[PDB]
Design a protein around this ligand. Sequence first.
Ligand SMILES: CC(=O)N[C@@H]1[C@@H](O)[C@H](O[C@@H]2O[C@H](CO)[C@H](O)[C@H](O[C@H]3O[C@H](CO)[C@H](O)[C@H](O)[C@H]3O)[C@H]2O)[C@@H](CO)O[C@H]1O
Ligand SMILES: CC(=O)N[C@@H]1[C@@H](O)[C@H](O[C@@H]2O[C@H](CO)[C@H](O)[C@H](O[C@H]3O[C@H](CO)[C@H](O)[C@H](O)[C@H]3O)[C@H]2O)[C@@H](CO)O[C@H]1O
Length: 245
Amino acid sequence: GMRTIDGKKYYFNTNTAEAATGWQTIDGKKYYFNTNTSIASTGYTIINDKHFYFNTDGIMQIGVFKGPDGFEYFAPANTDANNIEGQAIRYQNRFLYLHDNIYYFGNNSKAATGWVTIDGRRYYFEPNTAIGANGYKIIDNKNFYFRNGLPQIGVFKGPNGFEYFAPANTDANNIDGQAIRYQNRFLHLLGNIYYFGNNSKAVTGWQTINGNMYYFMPDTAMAAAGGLFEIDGVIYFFGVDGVKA
Ligand SMILES: CC(=O)N[C@@H]1[C@@H](O)[C@H](O[C@@H]2O[C@H](CO)[C@H](O)[C@H](O[C@H]3O[C@H](CO)[C@H](O)[C@H](O)[C@H]3O)[C@H]2O)[C@@H](CO)O[C@H]1O
Ligand SMILES: CC(=O)N[C@@H]1[C@@H](O)[C@H](O[C@@H]2O[C@H](CO)[C@H](O)[C@H](O[C@H]3O[C@H](CO)[C@H](O)[C@H](O)[C@H]3O)[C@H]2O)[C@@H](CO)O[C@H]1O
C-alpha cells in the first residue's frame, strides 16, 4: 500500500501505520523515500553524493534529464566504472544514442544544447530536451529541416509548403540548410529540377512556365524528367530538362 497525501507520496508497511524510508522496489520500479522525512523523492535528487532522477510519481528514471548543472546521463548499471543503476555518470566528449534519440555530451559530462560544432559539422540540440533536432524547425526566425541534429540541404515540405534549405551563401550569407528567399525561378540541384514561386515555395502539379509544360511531383516537388511518366493514368514524355514533349 503506497499512498499519496498532501501532494507527498509515502510507502506504508501495511500492518503498521508507519511510512518507510530509503530505497524501495515497488512493482519493478525503484523509489527513494528520503531517510529524514519518509517523503518520496521527485526530480533531480542527490543520494549518498550521487545523482539520480525520479519522475513526478517517484519512479527512478534512466536517461538524460536536466539538473541544476545541466543535462546529466542517468545510466544503467555498469556503464562506467561499474556505476549503480540510475546514477548519473561521467560521460565525456561523445555521442549517446538512446534509440533514435541522439545526444552529445561535453567535457563536463553534461549534454550540449543549442548550436554546436562537432568534428567539423554543425548540429542543433533542443534546449528543452538536449535531443538532436529532427524535421522542420524555426530557430531565431530562420527555418531548418533537420535529421539527427544536422540541418539538411535540399527541398523539404514544411507547414507552409516546400522551402529551399540552401547551401551556404546562396542569399544573405545563409549557413548550410537555412531556408531562403528564392523567387520565380528554377532550381537545378543534383540532377533534380524545381520551380519556386513568388512565395519562395516550390510549385507542384502541372505548370506552364514560359510556354513550356512541366509536372512537379506532389510529394517531392521535383519535375518529372528524363523519360516516360504515367500521370493520372496518361503516358507523357518529359525531356531531361523537365519539359513535356
Ligand atoms: C560543475 C561541472 O559540471 N563539472 C563537471 C563535472 O560534473 C564532471 O563530473 C562528472 O559529473 C557527472 C554528472 O554529470 C557525475 O557526477 C560523474 O561522477 C559520478 O559517476 C562516476 C562514474 O561515471 C562515479 O561513480 C562518481 O562517483 C559519481 O559521482 C562525474 O565524474 C566532470 C567530468 O566530466 O567535468 C566537470 O567539468
Ligand atoms: C506564407 C508565405 O508563404 N509567405 C511567403 C514567405 O514565406 C516568403 O518569405 C521567405 O520565406 C523563406 C522560406 O520559404 C525564408 O523564410 C525567407 O527568409 C529567410 O531568408 C532570407 C534570405 O534569403 C533572409 O536570410 C531572412 O532573414 C530569412 O528569414 C523569406 O524571405 C516571401 C518571399 O518569397 O513570400 C511570402 O509569400
